[PDB]
Amino acid sequence: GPHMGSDHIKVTQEQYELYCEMGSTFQLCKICAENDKDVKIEPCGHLMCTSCLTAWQESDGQGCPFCRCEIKGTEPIIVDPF
Numbered sequence: 001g002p003h004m005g006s007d008h009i010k011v012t013q014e015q016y017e018l019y020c021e022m023g024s025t026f027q028l029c030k031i032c033a034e035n036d037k038d039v040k041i042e043p044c045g046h047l048m049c050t051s052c053l054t055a056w057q058e059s060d061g062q063g064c065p066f067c068r069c070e071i072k073g074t075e076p077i078i079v080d081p082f
């Protein structure tokens with residue numbers, strides 16, 4: 001309900017560095033690796049591409065497909081690199 005507008009997240013060197021060993025980008029969805037996340041899962045804390053999420057929820061819909069657990073907090077946020 002709340003969090004009308006899109007939130008803003010800040011990336012940390014740790015993350016980039018972590019994903020650096022992989023050769024990818026955080027903001028970049030690790031689902032289709034085509035578009036950014038532009039979303040966030042809470043209270044868990046898993047990011048992903050909504051447009052992709054729907055695909056998951058279109059096949060199941062069992063909360064966050066990352067922790068296969070229901071979601072409480074969700075909204076269109078804007079991922080920003082460091």
Ligand SMILES: [Zn+2]
Pocket residue numbers: 029031032033034035036049050051052
């Ligand atoms: Zn995507």
Ligand SMILES: [Zn+2]
Pocket residue numbers: 041044045046064065066067068
């Ligand atoms: Zn999750």
